[PDB]
Amino acid sequence: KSKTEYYNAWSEWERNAPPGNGEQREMAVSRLRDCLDRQAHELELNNLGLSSLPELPPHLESLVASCNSLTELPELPQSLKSLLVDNNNLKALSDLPPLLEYLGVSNNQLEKLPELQNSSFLKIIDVDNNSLKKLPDLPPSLEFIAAGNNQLEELPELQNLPFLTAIYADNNSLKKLPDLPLSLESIVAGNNILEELPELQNLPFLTTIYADNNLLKTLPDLPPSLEALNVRDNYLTDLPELPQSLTFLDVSENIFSGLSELPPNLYYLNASSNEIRSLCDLPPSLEELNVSNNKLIELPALPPRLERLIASFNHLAEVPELPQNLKQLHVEYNPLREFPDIPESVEDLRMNS
Amino acid sequence: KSKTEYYNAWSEWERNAPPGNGEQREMAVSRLRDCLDRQAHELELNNLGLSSLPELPPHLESLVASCNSLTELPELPQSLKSLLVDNNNLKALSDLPPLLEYLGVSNNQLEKLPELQNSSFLKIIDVDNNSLKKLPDLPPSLEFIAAGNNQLEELPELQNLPFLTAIYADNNSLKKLPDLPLSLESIVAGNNILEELPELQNLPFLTTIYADNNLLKTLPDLPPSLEALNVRDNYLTDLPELPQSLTFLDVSENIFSGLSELPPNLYYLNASSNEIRSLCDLPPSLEELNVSNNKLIELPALPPRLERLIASFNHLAEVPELPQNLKQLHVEYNPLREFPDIPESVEDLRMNS
Amino acid sequence: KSKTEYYNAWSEWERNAPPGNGEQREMAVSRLRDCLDRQAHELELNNLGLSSLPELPPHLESLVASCNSLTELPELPQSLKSLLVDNNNLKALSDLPPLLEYLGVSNNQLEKLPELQNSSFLKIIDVDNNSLKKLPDLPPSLEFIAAGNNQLEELPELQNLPFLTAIYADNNSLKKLPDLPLSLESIVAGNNILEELPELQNLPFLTTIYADNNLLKTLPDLPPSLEALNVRDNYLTDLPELPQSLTFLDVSENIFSGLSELPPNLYYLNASSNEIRSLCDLPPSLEELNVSNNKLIELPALPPRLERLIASFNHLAEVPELPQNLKQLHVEYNPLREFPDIPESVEDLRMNS
Amino acid sequence: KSKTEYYNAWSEWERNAPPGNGEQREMAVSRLRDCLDRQAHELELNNLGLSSLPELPPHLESLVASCNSLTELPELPQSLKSLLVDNNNLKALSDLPPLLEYLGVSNNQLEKLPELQNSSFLKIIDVDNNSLKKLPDLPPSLEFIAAGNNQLEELPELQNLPFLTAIYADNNSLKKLPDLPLSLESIVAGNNILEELPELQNLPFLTTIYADNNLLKTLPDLPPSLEALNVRDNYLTDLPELPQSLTFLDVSENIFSGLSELPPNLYYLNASSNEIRSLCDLPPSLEELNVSNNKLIELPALPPRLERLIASFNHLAEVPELPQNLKQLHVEYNPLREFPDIPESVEDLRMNS
Ligand SMILES: [Ca+2]
Ligand SMILES: [Ca+2]
Ligand SMILES: [Ca+2]
Ligand SMILES: [Ca+2]
Ligand SMILES: [Ca+2]
Ligand SMILES: [Ca+2]
Ligand SMILES: [Ca+2]
Ligand SMILES: [Ca+2]
Ligand SMILES: [Ca+2]
Ligand SMILES: [Ca+2]
Ligand SMILES: [Ca+2]
Ligand SMILES: [Ca+2]
Ligand SMILES: [Ca+2]
Ligand SMILES: [Ca+2]
Ligand SMILES: [Ca+2]
Ligand SMILES: [Ca+2]
Ligand SMILES: [Ca+2]
Ligand SMILES: [Ca+2]
Ligand SMILES: [Ca+2]
Ligand SMILES: [Ca+2]
């Protein structure tokens, strides 16, 4: 097609803008034209309220039409490497362009996804916030898949994905997670109905695990290099040995009656809303301690690195001597006989006896 | 009717309890019987999930059937002095029992009220939270009427009610309030669309005025003995001379660029969310000062009686020396160069630089 | 003393009002005089910012000096039956007037209480919010004692108090509660460090138990006529058989993986923040169901009496058909495939997918 | 220096790690060594709790030592182009390295900054959240300066900064802003004490203006291509003609009695907490309308593009027909005679009558 044909196709599309629907087709056409004229790789029509897209520039490699009202996508060029149409009303996707590297279709109404396993270059799949009941098998090229906030009852096999480093499958109805790929560096699967996590100890690169809001009673042996573990709101009474690489630990809303050990390099500990009666010594690396809403009548010595202390809703008669770099002290609702001396560093303070 | 007839009428009513509707007719019948047997003045069937009431004990003087699913009321005895059926699904009321002194029908679906002006003993009318578009003229005996949260566009004439001491007509669509009765001690008419308040200065007994959330640009001369004035969220830039009897003042969410004067006996001042750049000296009587969300770069000397200081969301570099009985200090979000010394009395503290 | 001596003593006291401390001694003197002149039983000097009280009218039976800055109390008349000086700075109390029936000294700085067991008429002791480390033994006349928010590590023996019907000892450091008196109708001891509750099954009149925020792992057999049980935030996985008299149940923040049974007349159930995976059928009497923040993928049929449904933060794909009298629906943060039909009765709605 | 000297200097520094202070000098040394060995341009020692840094690798171009407890910085290489030491305890900075392009020292305790005007390559200055009372004159190379949350009473001259495109000077005590540079694309100066904004109409590139929380009574003629205007919490009753480029408008907490006009391409309008009695027609481009807490008894037709409608705390009897792509409906606290039909698109709903 000649530019004129595109221009006219686009102007026609523009004229067809549903009156009053605030569709910014003029801007879109302008983007389309510029894209066509510049022979630009990417076309960005974000937040233009487009209820549809006209034919796309012929050699578009990247279609960014996020935040529109697209219920359908125009045919995608075989040159398309990146499709970012998150926040649209897409209920379906045509088979992916052979060169698709990035599939950004989060916040849509996708009921199902087209086959993905044959997408030799599909590295990122973001189908987060859709109505996916199932995910097609994933392409070996998959490095990242966000399929959170869907209605997935199962995830396709993942262990054989050589490059899958990040999985977001939170807010689904996963009862189990498939065995994880050795390459996995991160898995966010909170708010599912995971009875248990798959084996994790053999995941040397898994550094982030979010399995909060699940039905976990125990955690498997953790990834040896786990750095962030969020299992907030589960039924954990204990934690397996914690990788010393763990710097972020959220075991809030579990049923810990205490924390016997904390990783030596933990920066963040959120153990709020457990039944923590006592905290083991805190690692000097600890910067944020949230043990809010527990049954602590006493906090252990606060690490001098502690910047955020949230120990509100506990039975503290006293807050230990505050570290001099403490930025935040939320010890609200504690039978504090007196407020602790507040370091000048404290910027955020909340205390209530 | 004999007790047996009542018992049986009641047992029949009990048996007619919609299955599964959790109606506690058995308890109700038990109450009914006890009432009948004891010849008790009052029958209390609160929160029994009753979708209806059977015939009431013959000489019931007080019917308390609050929190049920009554869509209709059984015929009320001519001996009824008190009708408390708040929180029901009453869409209408039969003409009131001649001796009705208390009409408690708040939280119902009353579309209209039966004539009230001829209720020689109607002292309290609580039709709050209903679907009243209008209130019938009020009985001279009216001492209290709560008709708030209705769809009243007007209130009936009130100035001629010799004993009306309290009017709750907040949350209605009143554009104006009728002239108020000399007897009025309190008027709560916030959340209406009052363009102005009626003359108030000639209301020697009016001690409480709630005209918050209206369309007030100014307040009339206030009741000389006004004690509580809540005109929160209006378009006030100024206040008329404040009665020295004023102990409670809420002028929050108005457009005060400052407060030049405060009643000498003010206990509570909520001037939050105005554009207060400066506060006049605070009366030593002040116990609670809420000037949160203003444009104060400085607070005046805090009265030693001050117990609650909410000056958060201001431009305070410093919080003045805190009074020794200060219980609450919320100065969160102020460019505080430093937190003020916190009196040991402070139980509730919130500071954020 | 002659009135003049009192007047002058009072005027002298008035003149001694610390300048600027907002003490309303003039009003106090006015109250004092009126009390003296009227020979009134009660003297009410509430919220007058009084840092002290002058000699009290000679035959005062009731001293109400709540909300002042009293650090000391003037000698109390032997005729004093009621002492209400809550919200003051009292650190100590002289031995109680022999006729003291009501000891209202909540919100003070009482470090200790004078002997109470010999107060033949002491019926109500409110020493809530003080700095009591211990409570003196209680008088057999004690019907009500609120000693909550203190530093009590133990409560005096209570089982022998024939008329003790209400105990508020929440917010203390009670590890155990003494055996409860047969007369006990209510015990509020939340926010203590109760490892367990004392035997309760032999308390036929105990209808209210608040043992929230403690260290309860189990509850003893409950008072047979228990009506309200709040054991919010404890370590409960199970509940003993629930008295059918139970209408209020708060087992939120415990470790329930489910609720197998609910009292047949339960009006209120707060089981939020547990690990509830399933709810047993709800009693048709249920008006408020709060199972917010659980692991419910499904709610049981909602009782038609249900007025408040808080099932937010769960894994609900669907909210069951809403009862027609539902006033509140908070099902925010649930993977709801769709919002349920909202009954016209719903006044308070919050949904978030 | 030889690597060994650096290694040893670093190991010595490491050994000097204050015991128990959680300083991760080992990791730092590891980073230092790797940096030295790799001859890397950048050294990243973020969040290592370092109370000090040892001598830096000799040809470091970028020092990233954010989130540490640095109170002092080691001598910076003349090769340093980027200094990112935000979130430290730096009270002073030595004269900047001649090649400094990025000065990231936000969240420190800088009382003053070294001369900056002679930093020929200083493009980004981030001294946000410090204790700067004044900013040295800025270098002509300055493209971005964030000096927000300081104690600036004045900003240095800016109009002559040819490349200054972004100024963050919010949360200071600026009474006035210097004339703005033609190059300015964004100015965030909310929470100052700006009596007025400088002339803006001659700023063709100024697309973002945040002057919220100031003392603005009026806005100057706006930058012709202004896209985002946040003047939340000011004393605005009117707005100058709004650039049609305006897509983001926050005039919340001002004193608008209404909005007569809205930019045709406005996506976001936050006019909450004004005294808006009526809204002009909404541009079809409007995606978010927040007129919460106003005095609206009626909302205008909702643009079909509207995704977020926050009209809570108003006097709405009815919510206009909701657009089919509405994602959020917060109309809580409105005397709604009935809830509007909720489009299936609504994911976030809050209604309260
Ligand atoms: Ca045009
Ligand atoms: Ca969704
Ligand atoms: Ca270990
Ligand atoms: Ca707990
Ligand atoms: Ca708790
Ligand atoms: Ca029975
Ligand atoms: Ca209502
Ligand atoms: Ca005056
Ligand atoms: Ca303001
Ligand atoms: Ca503000
Ligand atoms: Ca006087
Ligand atoms: Ca206390
Ligand atoms: Ca049972
Ligand atoms: Ca849970
Ligand atoms: Ca949860
Ligand atoms: Ca090591
Ligand atoms: Ca700061
Ligand atoms: Ca115009
Ligand atoms: Ca307003
Ligand atoms: Ca309002």
Tab-separated table of N, CA and C in Angstrom, chain B residues 84-182:
chain	number	residue	atom	x	y	z
B	84	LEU	N	-40.859	2.528	68.232
B	84	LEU	CA	-39.460	2.465	67.825
B	84	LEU	C	-39.280	1.298	66.881
B	85	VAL	N	-39.393	1.573	65.593
B	85	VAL	CA	-39.246	0.541	64.588
B	85	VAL	C	-38.197	0.976	63.585
B	86	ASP	N	-37.144	1.593	64.100
B	86	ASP	CA	-36.055	2.040	63.254
B	86	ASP	C	-35.429	0.791	62.663
B	87	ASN	N	-34.764	0.951	61.526
B	87	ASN	CA	-34.106	-0.168	60.883
B	87	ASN	C	-35.066	-1.291	60.541
B	88	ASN	N	-35.990	-0.962	59.658
B	88	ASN	CA	-36.965	-1.903	59.165
B	88	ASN	C	-37.139	-1.521	57.718
B	89	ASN	N	-38.124	-2.105	57.057
B	89	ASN	CA	-38.355	-1.823	55.652
B	89	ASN	C	-39.699	-1.154	55.471
B	90	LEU	N	-40.091	-0.369	56.465
B	90	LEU	CA	-41.364	0.324	56.416
B	90	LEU	C	-41.354	1.370	55.321
B	91	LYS	N	-42.323	1.292	54.417
B	91	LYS	CA	-42.408	2.259	53.333
B	91	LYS	C	-43.494	3.262	53.663
B	92	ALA	N	-44.328	2.909	54.631
B	92	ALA	CA	-45.411	3.784	55.040
B	92	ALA	C	-45.800	3.503	56.477
B	93	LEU	N	-46.475	4.467	57.083
B	93	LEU	CA	-46.941	4.339	58.450
B	93	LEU	C	-48.409	4.696	58.428
B	94	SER	N	-49.205	3.960	59.182
B	94	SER	CA	-50.617	4.269	59.246
B	94	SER	C	-50.665	5.504	60.123
B	95	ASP	N	-51.795	6.194	60.132
B	95	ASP	CA	-51.912	7.375	60.959
B	95	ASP	C	-51.461	6.988	62.348
B	96	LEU	N	-50.671	7.859	62.957
B	96	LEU	CA	-50.120	7.601	64.272
B	96	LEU	C	-51.134	7.407	65.378
B	97	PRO	N	-50.784	6.572	66.364
B	97	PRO	CA	-51.667	6.316	67.496
B	97	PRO	C	-51.818	7.694	68.136
B	98	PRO	N	-53.036	8.060	68.553
B	98	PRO	CA	-53.267	9.371	69.165
B	98	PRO	C	-52.321	9.772	70.289
B	99	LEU	N	-51.846	8.798	71.051
B	99	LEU	CA	-50.964	9.093	72.172
B	99	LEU	C	-49.478	8.998	71.848
B	100	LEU	N	-49.141	8.793	70.581
B	100	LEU	CA	-47.743	8.661	70.223
B	100	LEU	C	-46.898	9.842	70.688
B	101	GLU	N	-45.907	9.532	71.509
B	101	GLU	CA	-44.993	10.525	72.044
B	101	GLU	C	-43.657	10.405	71.328
B	102	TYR	N	-43.298	9.175	70.993
B	102	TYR	CA	-42.042	8.911	70.321
B	102	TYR	C	-42.280	8.133	69.039
B	103	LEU	N	-41.873	8.724	67.923
B	103	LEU	CA	-42.010	8.083	66.631
B	103	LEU	C	-40.609	7.790	66.113
B	104	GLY	N	-40.121	6.592	66.414
B	104	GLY	CA	-38.801	6.191	65.973
B	104	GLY	C	-38.923	5.273	64.779
B	105	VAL	N	-38.770	5.838	63.587
B	105	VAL	CA	-38.875	5.068	62.356
B	105	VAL	C	-37.681	5.338	61.457
B	106	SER	N	-36.548	5.640	62.068
B	106	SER	CA	-35.361	5.915	61.290
B	106	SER	C	-34.948	4.640	60.581
B	107	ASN	N	-34.155	4.794	59.529
B	107	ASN	CA	-33.666	3.651	58.791
B	107	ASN	C	-34.779	2.742	58.318
B	108	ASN	N	-35.665	3.317	57.529
B	108	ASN	CA	-36.758	2.577	56.955
B	108	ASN	C	-36.834	3.053	55.531
B	109	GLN	N	-37.956	2.806	54.878
B	109	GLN	CA	-38.104	3.220	53.499
B	109	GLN	C	-39.332	4.082	53.388
B	110	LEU	N	-39.606	4.829	54.449
B	110	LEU	CA	-40.765	5.696	54.466
B	110	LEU	C	-40.670	6.678	53.317
B	111	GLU	N	-41.674	6.650	52.453
B	111	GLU	CA	-41.712	7.531	51.296
B	111	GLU	C	-42.408	8.795	51.742
B	112	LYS	N	-43.272	8.638	52.735
B	112	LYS	CA	-44.014	9.748	53.285
B	112	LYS	C	-44.404	9.384	54.697
B	113	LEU	N	-44.738	10.391	55.485
B	113	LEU	CA	-45.140	10.165	56.856
B	113	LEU	C	-46.612	10.489	56.972
B	114	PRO	N	-47.303	9.862	57.925
B	114	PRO	CA	-48.724	10.181	58.057
B	114	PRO	C	-48.751	11.569	58.681
B	115	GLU	N	-49.911	12.209	58.689
B	115	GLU	CA	-50.019	13.529	59.287
B	115	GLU	C	-49.425	13.454	60.688
B	116	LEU	N	-48.697	14.490	61.084
B	116	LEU	CA	-48.057	14.512	62.392
B	116	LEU	C	-48.524	15.665	63.263
B	117	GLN	N	-48.958	16.745	62.626
B	117	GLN	CA	-49.373	17.935	63.350
B	117	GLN	C	-50.478	17.727	64.374
B	118	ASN	N	-51.285	16.686	64.206
B	118	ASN	CA	-52.360	16.438	65.155
B	118	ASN	C	-51.978	15.443	66.232
B	119	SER	N	-50.691	15.140	66.312
B	119	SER	CA	-50.208	14.223	67.328
B	119	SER	C	-49.897	15.071	68.550
B	120	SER	N	-50.932	15.293	69.348
B	120	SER	CA	-50.853	16.111	70.546
B	120	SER	C	-49.736	15.754	71.512
B	121	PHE	N	-49.225	14.532	71.432
B	121	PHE	CA	-48.180	14.114	72.352
B	121	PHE	C	-46.891	13.718	71.654
B	122	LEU	N	-46.855	13.876	70.337
B	122	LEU	CA	-45.665	13.526	69.577
B	122	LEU	C	-44.543	14.479	69.950
B	123	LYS	N	-43.604	13.997	70.753
B	123	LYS	CA	-42.482	14.815	71.192
B	123	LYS	C	-41.231	14.535	70.368
B	124	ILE	N	-40.994	13.263	70.072
B	124	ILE	CA	-39.825	12.881	69.303
B	124	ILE	C	-40.201	12.183	68.006
B	125	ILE	N	-39.732	12.735	66.896
B	125	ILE	CA	-39.968	12.145	65.595
B	125	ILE	C	-38.593	11.852	65.034
B	126	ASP	N	-38.302	10.576	64.851
B	126	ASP	CA	-37.038	10.184	64.277
B	126	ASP	C	-37.374	9.430	63.009
B	127	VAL	N	-37.312	10.131	61.887
B	127	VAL	CA	-37.586	9.527	60.598
B	127	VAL	C	-36.301	9.600	59.793
B	128	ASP	N	-35.191	9.706	60.511
B	128	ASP	CA	-33.891	9.771	59.882
B	128	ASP	C	-33.691	8.559	58.991
B	129	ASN	N	-32.964	8.760	57.904
B	129	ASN	CA	-32.661	7.693	56.974
B	129	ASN	C	-33.898	6.983	56.441
B	130	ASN	N	-34.647	7.701	55.626
B	130	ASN	CA	-35.831	7.161	55.004
B	130	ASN	C	-35.841	7.746	53.614
B	131	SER	N	-36.983	7.710	52.950
B	131	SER	CA	-37.058	8.260	51.612
B	131	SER	C	-38.097	9.355	51.594
B	132	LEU	N	-38.120	10.136	52.664
B	132	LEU	CA	-39.070	11.224	52.777
B	132	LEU	C	-38.670	12.383	51.879
B	133	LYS	N	-39.595	12.784	51.015
B	133	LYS	CA	-39.367	13.893	50.099
B	133	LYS	C	-39.872	15.126	50.828
B	134	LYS	N	-40.800	14.902	51.750
B	134	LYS	CA	-41.374	15.982	52.528
B	134	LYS	C	-41.792	15.480	53.895
B	135	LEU	N	-41.826	16.391	54.856
B	135	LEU	CA	-42.252	16.058	56.201
B	135	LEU	C	-43.593	16.726	56.385
B	136	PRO	N	-44.564	16.012	56.959
B	136	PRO	CA	-45.866	16.649	57.156
B	136	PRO	C	-45.629	17.778	58.156
B	137	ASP	N	-46.566	18.707	58.275
B	137	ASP	CA	-46.372	19.777	59.236
B	137	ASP	C	-46.194	19.122	60.591
B	138	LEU	N	-45.368	19.729	61.428
B	138	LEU	CA	-45.079	19.156	62.725
B	138	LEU	C	-46.046	19.545	63.826
B	139	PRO	N	-46.240	18.642	64.797
B	139	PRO	CA	-47.142	18.887	65.921
B	139	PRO	C	-46.489	19.852	66.898
B	140	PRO	N	-47.276	20.766	67.475
B	140	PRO	CA	-46.758	21.743	68.433
B	140	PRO	C	-46.030	21.068	69.584
B	141	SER	N	-46.318	19.789	69.793
B	141	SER	CA	-45.692	19.039	70.871
B	141	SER	C	-44.287	18.589	70.501
B	142	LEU	N	-43.955	18.688	69.221
B	142	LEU	CA	-42.650	18.255	68.750
B	142	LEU	C	-41.496	18.911	69.492
B	143	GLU	N	-40.662	18.091	70.116
B	143	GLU	CA	-39.518	18.603	70.845
B	143	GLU	C	-38.267	18.200	70.098
B	144	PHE	N	-38.380	17.107	69.363
B	144	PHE	CA	-37.240	16.591	68.647
B	144	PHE	C	-37.638	15.912	67.363
B	145	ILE	N	-37.007	16.329	66.278
B	145	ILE	CA	-37.258	15.693	65.012
B	145	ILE	C	-35.949	15.465	64.286
B	146	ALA	N	-35.706	14.202	63.969
B	146	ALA	CA	-34.528	13.809	63.229
B	146	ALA	C	-35.136	13.337	61.927
B	147	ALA	N	-34.859	14.063	60.855
B	147	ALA	CA	-35.376	13.718	59.543
B	147	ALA	C	-34.195	13.754	58.592
B	148	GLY	N	-33.015	13.550	59.157
B	148	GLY	CA	-31.813	13.563	58.360
B	148	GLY	C	-31.767	12.372	57.430
B	149	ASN	N	-30.925	12.479	56.412
B	149	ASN	CA	-30.746	11.422	55.439
B	149	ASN	C	-32.064	11.000	54.825
B	150	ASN	N	-32.736	11.974	54.244
B	150	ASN	CA	-33.982	11.739	53.561
B	150	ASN	C	-33.812	12.478	52.255
B	151	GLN	N	-34.909	12.844	51.614
B	151	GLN	CA	-34.816	13.551	50.349
B	151	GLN	C	-35.633	14.816	50.480
B	152	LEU	N	-35.622	15.364	51.686
B	152	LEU	CA	-36.361	16.574	51.965
B	152	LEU	C	-35.757	17.736	51.203
B	153	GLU	N	-36.605	18.455	50.487
B	153	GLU	CA	-36.157	19.609	49.741
B	153	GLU	C	-36.539	20.814	50.580
B	154	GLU	N	-37.429	20.578	51.531
B	154	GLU	CA	-37.886	21.614	52.438
B	154	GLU	C	-38.290	20.958	53.738
B	155	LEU	N	-38.262	21.736	54.805
B	155	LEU	CA	-38.683	21.255	56.099
B	155	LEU	C	-39.985	21.993	56.328
B	156	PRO	N	-40.906	21.403	57.090
B	156	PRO	CA	-42.150	22.136	57.307
B	156	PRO	C	-41.815	23.342	58.173
B	157	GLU	N	-42.768	24.249	58.332
B	157	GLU	CA	-42.543	25.423	59.157
B	157	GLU	C	-42.143	24.921	60.532
B	158	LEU	N	-41.173	25.586	61.145
B	158	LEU	CA	-40.692	25.158	62.446
B	158	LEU	C	-40.789	26.235	63.509
B	159	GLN	N	-40.678	27.487	63.081
B	159	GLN	CA	-40.694	28.620	63.996
B	159	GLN	C	-41.843	28.629	64.991
B	160	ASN	N	-42.946	27.968	64.659
B	160	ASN	CA	-44.092	27.942	65.558
B	160	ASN	C	-44.143	26.723	66.461
B	161	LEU	N	-43.077	25.930	66.449
B	161	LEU	CA	-43.007	24.762	67.311
B	161	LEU	C	-42.414	25.267	68.612
B	162	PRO	N	-43.264	25.458	69.626
B	162	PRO	CA	-42.867	25.951	70.944
B	162	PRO	C	-41.887	25.090	71.721
B	163	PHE	N	-41.853	23.796	71.434
B	163	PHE	CA	-40.972	22.912	72.180
B	163	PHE	C	-39.905	22.219	71.355
B	164	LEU	N	-39.816	22.563	70.076
B	164	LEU	CA	-38.814	21.945	69.224
B	164	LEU	C	-37.437	22.419	69.665
B	165	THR	N	-36.658	21.511	70.227
B	165	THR	CA	-35.339	21.875	70.700
B	165	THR	C	-34.241	21.289	69.831
B	166	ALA	N	-34.555	20.226	69.109
B	166	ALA	CA	-33.549	19.606	68.265
B	166	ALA	C	-34.088	19.219	66.910
B	167	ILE	N	-33.368	19.637	65.881
B	167	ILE	CA	-33.742	19.321	64.521
B	167	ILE	C	-32.553	18.693	63.832
B	168	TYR	N	-32.763	17.501	63.303
B	168	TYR	CA	-31.734	16.822	62.549
B	168	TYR	C	-32.384	16.719	61.193
B	169	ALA	N	-31.808	17.419	60.227
B	169	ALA	CA	-32.338	17.422	58.881
B	169	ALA	C	-31.148	17.379	57.943
B	170	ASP	N	-30.028	16.908	58.466
B	170	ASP	CA	-28.823	16.789	57.672
B	170	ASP	C	-29.083	15.770	56.579
B	171	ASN	N	-28.214	15.757	55.579
B	171	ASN	CA	-28.334	14.800	54.500
B	171	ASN	C	-29.706	14.767	53.869
B	172	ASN	N	-30.126	15.929	53.408
B	172	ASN	CA	-31.386	16.082	52.726
B	172	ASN	C	-31.020	17.009	51.600
B	173	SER	N	-32.000	17.583	50.928
B	173	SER	CA	-31.672	18.500	49.854
B	173	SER	C	-32.286	19.834	50.177
B	174	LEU	N	-32.164	20.216	51.440
B	174	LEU	CA	-32.702	21.486	51.884
B	174	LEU	C	-31.842	22.594	51.296
B	175	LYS	N	-32.490	23.549	50.642
B	175	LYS	CA	-31.775	24.675	50.072
B	175	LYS	C	-31.834	25.748	51.141
B	176	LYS	N	-32.893	25.692	51.937
B	176	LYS	CA	-33.080	26.639	53.018
B	176	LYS	C	-33.694	25.927	54.197
B	177	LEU	N	-33.500	26.493	55.371
B	177	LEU	CA	-34.086	25.933	56.564
B	177	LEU	C	-35.190	26.899	56.900
B	178	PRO	N	-36.326	26.388	57.376
B	178	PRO	CA	-37.412	27.301	57.724
B	178	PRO	C	-36.882	28.146	58.876
B	179	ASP	N	-37.556	29.240	59.206
B	179	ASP	CA	-37.094	30.024	60.333
B	179	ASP	C	-37.147	29.053	61.494
B	180	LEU	N	-36.168	29.143	62.378
B	180	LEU	CA	-36.090	28.229	63.491
B	180	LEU	C	-36.887	28.669	64.701
B	181	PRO	N	-37.432	27.698	65.445
B	181	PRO	CA	-38.219	27.987	66.640
B	181	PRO	C	-37.326	28.501	67.754
B	182	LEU	N	-37.849	29.454	68.506
B	182	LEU	CA	-37.132	30.049	69.615
B	182	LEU	C	-36.603	28.970	70.550
